[PDB]
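Replying to the earlier thread about multi-chain prediction with a worked example.

Input:
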Amino acid sequence: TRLKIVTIHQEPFVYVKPTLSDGTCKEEFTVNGDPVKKVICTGPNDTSPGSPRHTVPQCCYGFCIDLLIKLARTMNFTYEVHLVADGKFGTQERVNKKEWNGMMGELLSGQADMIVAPLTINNERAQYIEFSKPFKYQGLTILVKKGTRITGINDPRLRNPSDKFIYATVKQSSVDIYFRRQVELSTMYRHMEKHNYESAAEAIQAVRDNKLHAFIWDSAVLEFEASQKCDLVTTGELFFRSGFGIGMRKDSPWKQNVSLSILKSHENGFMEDLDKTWVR
Amino acid sequence: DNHLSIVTLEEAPFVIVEDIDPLTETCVRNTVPCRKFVKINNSTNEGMNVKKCCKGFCIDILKKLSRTVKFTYDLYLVTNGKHGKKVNNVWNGMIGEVVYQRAVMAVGSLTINEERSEVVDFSVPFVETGISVMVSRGTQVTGLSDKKFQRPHDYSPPFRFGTVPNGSTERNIRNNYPYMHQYMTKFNQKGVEDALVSLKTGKLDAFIYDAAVLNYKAGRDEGCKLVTIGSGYIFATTGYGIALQKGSPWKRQIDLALLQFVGDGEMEELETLWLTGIC
Ligand SMILES: Cc1sc2nc(COc3ccc(F)cc3)cc(=O)n2c1[C@@H]1C[C@H]1CO
Ligand SMILES: N[C@@H](CCC(=O)O)C(=O)O
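Result:
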């Protein structure tokens, strides 16, 4: 019937703003004169770890929200959007049992029927869920405050670390999974697990406040952040390449038509339009 | 039932075809056996399977899959068309071989697209592709939406550009830019090699084709004259995928193995081995 969509705050794929006093979303327009499509997305505000979460209606828009609207119009489904309760993308952590957290956990438990977010396709998650064909191909890069001279992934301050040069990623994300899985990056993983952040926004802020020297994250996010905050720059190109897909349960009756619609959107230039509107 | 009929198609450096050894009469080194049905004459349906040897990026992918997913295979080269085209509602090429169950899977430089996905399942993409435009360095073309392409007769003389017809690139152009398409057909190129010679000798202004192959060709071009427009720009981004029959029992393990190779660096190693160039 009516799909429960889970998403996450992640500019510029998903912007999250408070509603107006009357519970509606502020009317905005692109420089292109076009109306900004916004959806009501419920979610918690107090992001404090180990604290109660009070769910309130909020405003959601961006690359992934425009993508959701297109999917819903094409496949003729209605929906309700909520933000992931723990604010995480999702990893499998050991409890004898193992459990998925973040959007992955919500999808598997039935709290969501579909993940519509910059969700990285990897082997770990594909074992438990259905990913659509990718809606974006990107990769991993490093974000630094302008003036920080790092060469990239093979820099000695990264490969042979110390508490002098702090670097991190986002907890319970695909980047966390990547560094934990690859033994060749264990030296990096051990340094990162001592300083990883709750969300990409906190990590981007920490780099600005000179509290974090390097943030290892998605290039589609970091390059957009660099282009807007001229005090931050990415260092090098991509050291790894990954794509974002729509997440569904392996039994979903929408999985074939979701992929077909994403292919249609790439082929007719709709996806490139979204990239121009929200990214470039 | 793990002995699989697998279809392929030559397209360097993804799939390269070689003659079987003169002494050994077997396939050695980094090559695998691949058969090709070759007709006796054009007045008969009679032909013979010629034993050939296959290598390349997609062949190293097949070798990895065979070993991880635990299947053996009888690899053959498609003779009824190429990658895949719907002709009078009938699929030919690698797609057709899968649709009509002559092959369990198609391994090669096979573009994932919507109409192919309605008749076959595709694995996760293992190589990024889509459509790129090859030109002589410094040619001033913005992209596929450039008016030189969209409205070619608005220029005197009109810009000369073509593709290799019957593939995913021509299909996309046909579907998206009907005027550009009907104009381009007089510039149809028999293959990549003919197109590169036409560009290099001034008989063509632009060549529109598969991004993965064009990026490879640009990186190996003698004198680094032929380039792709933009920073190696890609329209209608997609990928090469393994085509499987609808509801295939093999898809699950193939997807997981491919994603394992991506995450491990095994995919990056193949790219360094087969796809890097000097330009
Ligand atoms: C390796 C490669 S090459 C590759 N290319 C792309 C490029 O965009 C698309 C979009 C649609 C499509 F049908 C096919 C590709 C995405 C991507 O994720 N990848 C990947 C990772 C492994 C696959 C996960 O989906
Ligand atoms: N890779 C393409 C062939 C080349 C092209 O049309 O660009 C296909 O699978 O059809």
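Chain B is about 30% helix and 25% strand.

Feel free to reuse this layout for your own posts.
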